[PDB]
Amino acid sequence: TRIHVVQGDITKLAVDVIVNAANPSLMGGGGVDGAIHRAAGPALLDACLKVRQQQGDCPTGHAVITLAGDLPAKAVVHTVGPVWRGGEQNEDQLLQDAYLNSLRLVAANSYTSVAFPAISTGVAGYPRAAAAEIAVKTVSEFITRHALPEQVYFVCYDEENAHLYERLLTQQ
């Protein structure tokens, strides 16, 4: 009732907050990051600079929040997922933290709905399967303990991944 899987483009989703799979610089890149910036327009980058200027690099596992410009969302939460390196560099934790701190920021800003892409599973090369496990476990356990956020959307770029989530979800 509170967690949903949707297949498509995260930039098209009308929710309170859209989550960006960013990198420490916060400055832009490709994948979701590029899509988001493109969709949002220049205001997003202005904003990310202001942030950067104020707290420097966003460390891995942490998150920040900014305005959303032209996006149908109200804000964008930029989180820094870990780069995959075999699984013996505390990656699973860092990925967890990325989801967690994202959620906390959503809540702290009184936002009721949030959309997540599949953090760290593209360029960063996180095994698609383990990641989804963490994403789903972390988000689920969190929303269990908290009123906010009310709604969560797992946005999946393809059908393969979507089914993954779908199953992992109803597998508990």
Ligand SMILES: Nc1ncnc2c1ncn2[C@@H]1O[C@H](COP(=O)(O)OP(=O)(O)OC[C@H]2O[C@@H](O)[C@H](O)[C@@H]2O)[C@@H](O)[C@H]1O
């Ligand atoms: N428009 C989109 N909407 C939803 N999901 C998307 C979109 N584009 C890509 N994705 C999904 O987002 C996931 C993350 O892919 P990337 O966008 O490449 O980001 P990620 O793998 O988290 O990269 C994180 C790492 O790479 C650098 O960007 C950065 O330095 C960071 O450490 C993938 O599983 C992919 O299917």
